[PDB]
Amino acid sequence: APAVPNKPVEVKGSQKTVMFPHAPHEKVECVTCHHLVDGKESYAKCGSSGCHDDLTAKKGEKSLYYVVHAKGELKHTSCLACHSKVVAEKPELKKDLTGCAKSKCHP
Ligand code: HEM
Ligand code: HEM
Ligand code: HEM
Numbered sequence: 286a287p288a289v290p291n292k293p294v295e296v297k298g299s300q301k302t303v304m305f306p307h308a309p310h311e312k313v314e315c316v317t318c319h320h321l322v323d324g325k326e327s328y329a330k331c332g333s334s335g336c337h338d339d340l341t342a343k344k345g346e347k348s349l350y351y352v353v354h355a356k357g358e359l360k361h362t363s364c365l366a367c368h369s370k371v372v373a374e375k376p377e378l379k380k381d382l383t384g385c386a387k388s389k390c391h392p
């Protein structure tokens with residue numbers, strides 16, 4: 286695999302950009318997020334052409350907003366789905382990991 290980035294990286298939408306840190310996710314398997322595509326591994330950007338390249342729609346497989354924020358029923362784990370399970374076990378982190386304002390994603 287390539288080396289994991291050692292600094293936070295940009296995740297751009299149509300209007301806002303959020304910084305993603307790999308360090309706190311050191312014990313999550315790479316494949317949980319960089320999922321297989323047509324049975325092969327890939328570390329391309331999520332919003333790459335032919336991937337989740339619709340930067341304005343809020344629903345649908347092709348929407349980057351949806352694959353990031355949807356709370357349930359998906360084929361792979363979204364950022365908000367996993368963070369909601371962590372907050373049930375560590376409720377002190379609710380606003381940092383799930384808030385829409387003043388959180389670690391949208392400070
Ligand atoms: C597991 C150790 C693992 C590896 C390896 C890895 C690599 C990696 C690379 C090479 C990039 C840069 C992509 C580029 O082409 O610029 C990258 C970026 C993102 N990653 Fe990652 N990553 C590993 C693990 C994880 C885990 C566990 C998750 C989810 C919690 C995750 C997520 C992301 C995200 C988001 C990005 C940014 C993509 C974008 O569209 O900007 N990585 N990773
Ligand atoms: C970048 C790390 C990235 C993320 C994040 C991500 C998430 C993701 C989710 C949550 C789903 C399920 C959506 C649903 O159930 O409606 C999902 C599904 C697909 N993905 Fe994805 N995805 C990331 C990376 C990439 C890349 C680099 C591509 C293009 C090669 C891509 C494509 C797809 C496709 C196609 C699907 C639908 C079928 C499936 O495998 O579930 N994703 N992704
Ligand atoms: C989806 C790409 C996604 C994002 C975005 C994301 C962000 C994120 C941040 C900003 C933090 C806080 C770290 C800090 O304050 O420096 C954080 C922390 C944790 N996350 Fe996350 N995360 C995304 C995805 C996922 C997934 C899919 C999981 C679970 C499979 C996950 C888990 C965690 C955990 C655990 C932490 C640390 C919590 C703690 O106990 O301190 N994240 N994430």
Ligand code: HEM
Pocket residue numbers: 296297298299300301302303340341349350351353354364365368381382383384385386388389390391
């Ligand atoms: C709380 C549920 C919450 C809301 C609501 C929210 C909104 C939001 C918007 C409107 C954007 C901009 C869309 C665009 O520019 O196209 C956006 C972008 C991102 N968000 Fe978000 N968001 C909420 C919560 C969180 C949390 C807790 C995290 C981190 C786990 C997070 C992450 C992201 C990421 C990544 C982006 C950029 C990619 C994209 O969705 O286009 N959000 N958010």
